Symmetry: C6
Subunit: 304 residues, 6 copies
């Protein structure tokens, strides 16, 4: 909905957003939204996501797909009303995204999802990319385990010519919806194929907000494979504007750079990671500042 | 409708337009359209805006969506007639924009919406863009608070990978319609996606006129993300063409340039703005 | 319809076309077509114009829209037959343009619409463009008043972010149809937005002939805004082939160049205009030859 | 249909094709096909042409449109069968082009349509183009009158911002069908607009064969207006492959070059024309060899 | 269908393919498929080819179009099954190409279609193209007569602005299907338009295999009209890829180069041709 | 489905994946999946593949096409449910790919399919390409026989202007489905034509995963024919991201380079092959290390 502000209310918002990343306890936001979801009336639609065609499928708090649901409206303080209606397995009325309020009026945050090696990591979407020798697959799995901490991380596999890999986009969005409804740390191996169908386009522009709202982190690998300037720019765009955080390889082997957006209008931070391989290519992340928008695009032409 | 003129009537129009920006009391136009809107019968369609598909949804004076409305025509002096029909949640007959006359025959204005730091600002749409380090988000919020003055400003959020951000275009136009119906100062953070679906195209070419007619100001940030090349001249200009006013960053950090169209065929004015950050990235616009 | 000729009949046609611009009394053609329109059977379709979708709406001699009209045919001397049928507010049979004969066999003319400052101006469409400091809006209004002479000129406003401006294409074609049915001098402020939907394309290629046939003049402003070579060429094309006359700014402030097509196969003439601003930006046009096709395109790359 | 040949039958065909242009009496082929058309059963479909949408309308020998016609088949010596069926004003079964045999087994000709100034001119389609000062409109009218000789020539007007000009494509194909059914010499002023909808594409690739089959000549003006390489190549293509003859302007004022295809597999001939203007821009063509395919494209880059 | 192989069966296949071009009697493959086609029940679908829209029409062994045909399946050794159903003039079930087995398990051949001037020519599709003065039309007709030998050659005319030329794609595929069903040597003058509608795309990718299976040769002229730039390498190559053989003009007038694919995985042969004109532009191919 | 991991479970997965290629007995994975397929309830859908239009056809364990099958669901441990429904010969509910679990939780492998000349070869898809004199057809047949070993290899022929070649895409996917259901070693001669319709696009992104899951190898030839940078990049993409292994020609006659992905996140290996021709062009492969991602793209510009 829309929000109204004056100098005072705005200043409070910024302070709260700042705290959501810098001081709140890592993962507390995720736990809180888990609570909100559990308190739902059962059978109540909570998440809508687009399939290949552009239509949307809906799920309940238990990641179970809803096939039929009679029109129902809800009026917010905004005075605005939201309507949800599912017919024959597809949304007839409503919008893509969370169908239940998880954020209240605390919007524009990058809720801290975890802490590792002395650094705080944001929830939302993290694209792991770059052009070079450093492999993205080992990195996403190492980051998943590290941010998972005490918890296991969920792995969504898509579009790779390996055994057991799903290659159907609609099964893909199904795996993603379930993962965000049930886990704090999610790894998507290969944003390839996607990034174009309406579903792929919707996913690319929806996933970050969905994840940040839940307080979970989606770690997706993306190889700037094709050097075709039409998609090379689609990679730099996805990385630039559709990601909450970015993890890119450097010219030094095993070294990665992490660029993270700490919140609406807040500063973008950066830190470095060193890594090394163990047996069977298992990667380990070793454990022992702002970057202008100009320095940011300097990082972007790396993908070019 | 169409208007007829001779040298005399034209001269009067130009004088009236000039006054609408230069001498009228800041925000008086908004108050006047508020009065007109309040006089509508309730359930009577007042605003129609396009959704993603190109279809249009309709609202009453209370920002309530109209699902069903039997055909109804209205004849003007122009001799022309307007018709409005809503069926199953979508407009069957009518046009996009205000469905009620707010402007009378005073058209082609950039009604003054506020005065700040010694400068008068126009209503309509204001695009804040440019390439560089100066952040657009802090600027639109600072501008919203300053132009809001004694009133709070409304914030419409869209398309950013942050918590609580709506990314569905249809919810977006809904937020925008409600905002223009109820507030004088509106901030849209991120005109992404738009600038393309038919809805996005309709929005870009309708919003400025809708806002100027109401007397409200829509302050929208637009990052020339697509490319970092001096293609920033692309979205710009295209911005300058569908905007009542333009606010672009300069090569000096914290400094911005304001270019404003004072009216139909009138002079385009320009002034500079100096700014600085406080705690938690709150931006402040200096005033002489 | 089609016309047959031999050396003699052709020579007569050219002489008549030449007179329609050079010797006829300014505005006489308009008065004549006004007469033909008034003699129509009432309720009889006289004008058809395309809406955004590509369909067409129809009007009667009083600029009133026709919603229902049973099939009716008419056979010309050409032996050919025209049919008109309106159903549910849209043309079911017929063509875009004038549905009644206003020109007889006198075709291919640029009927003189007015005289001012010692120059004759043609009816049809006039595009006012150019890239520079000189503003198009003040010029179109000054030209409207001047060519209007004793009569007022009509103003159609479209697609500008100012108060009271219509931005819906279908309302636009409605204003245009009514203007051409009722006035001799018409100003269209902003051909922007248009110039692409089927309606916009139809309008661009129909309006000049519609206006020239009626004997009215449509003065439209067009800023070569975007420097995107795909539409910059659409501007040079519209100006080159879809305009009866062209008014372009020069490198000297306040100075404009008028290029006018005097008729089918006739010479394109050119003259200059000097202007100055009064109070509230009101512009005034001060009052005190052929141009090859090569010199013509030299004028075109100005827009490039 | 398909034709079978051996050395002897092939040699006869070539001799006959050669005669159809070089020795037959000018205009005799037209007279012959007029005879074939007059002997048709009345109400019998003879010509089908595509409208904007891609559908086709049908006409009888009197240029009258056929709205309903029950399925009817005809078996040729080829063993193949042709079927024609019109329903609700549109062809339901059949093909675009002549629906009646006018050529017999004498195919691949460029029937001489007329003789003037000591040169034989071919029937089929003639595109008058080139980039320069020389005007196409005066040239097509002068060529129409000259080739018309004792007969008047028909003029089809389309897409120009002048009085009385039709701008609706469907009315345009209607005028063309009627013209080819009733006259030997036809002038089309402005192939602009066309040259893209399915109808425009069909017209461009059908008209030459339709005209050559009838023995009539269609003289069409085409300005290489837009210097947009996507249509500049569409102009060089239309001129190169869709025209029976080409008439292009040169770098010398008033001079034109005529390139004509004399028949299937035969030599392309070329000759020059000198012209001058009289009163009211009436143009006159004054009256007192093979060109390789290489020299031909050298003529083409003139349009580029 | 799919075929299985081991070193031995594969070696035999390659030997058979080699013989199909190098040692078999010229034209024997055509005669053999003629025999097979003649053995079909009549009214039984044998050929399916695509029309402009992408749909397909069906013909019997007599080149008669099949309007209605109730479903009927056939199981092979492969275990796979083929189905054919025609409804209202169009194929409802089936595939494009030959609907009857002509080749047996001898696949991947370029069956010799004729011998002339000391060279063996392959059946299948032959594209005649290139940039330059040498005219394609006279060459395809001369080649048709020479390969026809004792038999006349069939000529399919399409898309040229000359008298009696069909310009409707659907009539075109009809002429082509009939030609391949009834003749060994076919000439197509102008593969215009094609090289795009679905029908044109299907034609380009089907015709070569259809012709090679039958044992007939389709000689098509293709003018790289679109552009005169060295883009003649575009249509070419693309020609070389969908053609069994290529005939391209050289920089010496009257001289042409013949590139022919002798079979699946076999060597591509090349030889030169000298030619000259007689009366009325009749072209003659010199023979040593 | 999605899988959860912690350091320990992840390490076990990597060890198992490593073994699936390096130590398991060549072809054992294929034999195992053959077993799983034979245990299916008969008439039970096991494979779905896309046809030209984008729709999908379904097969049973005997490579027989399923035309009708009433909705049936299955719940996995993931909690997620899969549904399959076939109506009128096309899938109404379900996804493309294997409709039965063949991999269990052992995902992301490149199951060894065979061993030859001292090298292990992976299952999945192998694209044989490169630009040069070395012919792809003789190489795919030699590799088919070699990897086939004691078993015969299956050959799918498509889109070549030779006798007996199918050129209809839908018959093509039918041959491929049957081949993967019944044989370990498959050769596809010509991925030309494909690599664009929805079916072609689906095939390109599905086949590798389908094959790796079954444990069979699909050896496909692909000539980088057209030097049109829009498809030349589609070739480098298909080779780079849609292949489990790549076999490319070098600048030395008869020599080829084999690049193989050994598993999810594992190292890409490379070795060389020497070959020579016998009689009738029968090719023989003579029988007597990691390559960075940088060296990998250096191999890619060969196709450019």
């Amino acid at each position: 909905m829309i929000h109204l502000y004056d100098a005072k209310s705005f200043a409070k918002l910024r302070a709260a957003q700042y705290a959501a990343f810098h001081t709140d306890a890592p993962g507390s936001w995720f736990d809180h939204t888990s609570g909100v979801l559990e308190s739902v009336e059962d059978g109540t639609p909570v998440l809508a996501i687009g399939v290949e065609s552009g239509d949307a499928i809906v799920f309940d708090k238990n990641a179970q797909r809803i096939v039929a649901y009679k029109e129902k409206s809800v009026k917010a303080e905004d005075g605005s009303v939201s309507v949800v209606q599912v017919e024959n397995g597809f949304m007839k009325q409503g919008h893509r995204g969370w169908l239940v309020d998880l954020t209240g009026e605390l919007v524009g945050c990058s809720p801290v999802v975890a802490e590792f090696g002395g650094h705080r990591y944001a929830s939302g979407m993290v694209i792991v990319t770059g052009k070079g020798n450093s492999g993205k697959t080992p990195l996403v799995h190492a980051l998943g385990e590290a941010l998972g901490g005490k918890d296991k991380y969920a792995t969504v596999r898509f579009g790779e010519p390996l055994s057991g890999y799903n290659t159907d986009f609609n099964v893909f969005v199904d795996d993603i919806a379930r993962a965000m409804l049930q886990h704090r740390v999610i790894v998507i191996d290969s944003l390839k194929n996607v990034i174009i169908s309406r579903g792929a386009f919707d996913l690319l522009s929806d996933i970050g907000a969905m994840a940040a709202s839940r307080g979970c982190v989606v770690i997706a690998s993306l190889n700037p494979t094709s050097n075709d300037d039409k998609i090379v720019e689609l990679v730099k765009e996805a990385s630039r504007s559709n990601s909450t955080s970015l993890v890119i390889s450097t010219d030094v082997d095993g070294e990665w750079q992490v660029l993270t957006r700490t919140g609406e209008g807040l500063q973008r931070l950066t830190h470095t990671l060193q890594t090394s391989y163990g047996e069977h290519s298992v990667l380990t992340i070793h454990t022992s500042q702002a970057s202008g928008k100009a320095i940011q695009t300097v990082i972007k032409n790396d993908e070019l």
